[PDB]
Design a protein around this nucleic acid. Sequence first.
RNA 1: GGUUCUCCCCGAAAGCUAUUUAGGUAGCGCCUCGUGAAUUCAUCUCCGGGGGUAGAGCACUGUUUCGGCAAGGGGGUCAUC
Length: 51
Amino acid sequence: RLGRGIGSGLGKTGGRGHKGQKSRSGGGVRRGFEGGQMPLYRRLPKFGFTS
RNA sequence: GGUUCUCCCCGAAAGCUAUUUAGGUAGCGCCUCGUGAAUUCAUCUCCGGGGGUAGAGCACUGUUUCGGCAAGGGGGUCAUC
Ligand SMILES: [Mg+2]
Ligand SMILES: [Mg+2]
Ligand SMILES: [Mg+2]
Ligand SMILES: [Mg+2]
Ligand SMILES: [Mg+2]
Ligand SMILES: [Mg+2]
C-alpha cells in the first residue's frame, strides 16, 4: 500500500520516482516505444508467410 | 501541485548511445530481490607485456637569433655592339 506515510517506505511518491511519465496519472509510453526511434520490430524486415 | 500508520535489511544516478531529441524516453552502466556457479573477483609481491604522455631534444616537419664561409639578388660608378 503505497502513499500511506513515511514508515511504509512508499510515501509521497508511490514508488514512481519524481515527475516522469510513470509518475503521471495515466502516463507512460506504449509497447515497443524506443524513445522516438522506430522500434526493432520496425527496423527489421518482414519475412515468410503463414501456411 | 499533492499523495495519509510503523519497524527492519540493502542501497543509486544526474553517465554513454539514439531520438521533430535536448526540463521526455528507450537500451546499456550503476541499485535491489531471487536462483545458480568455479581457489570466480579485488588488493600486494614477482614475472611477462604494448605505450610514446610528462619531461627532454632539434636529425626530420616548421619556427628563431648570432657568427663564419658564400653563390645569388638589389643599388651606384664606368661601359652599356
Ligand atoms: Mg525509499
Ligand atoms: Mg513531485
Ligand atoms: Mg519518473
Ligand atoms: Mg548501509
Ligand atoms: Mg519537455
Ligand atoms: Mg611534451
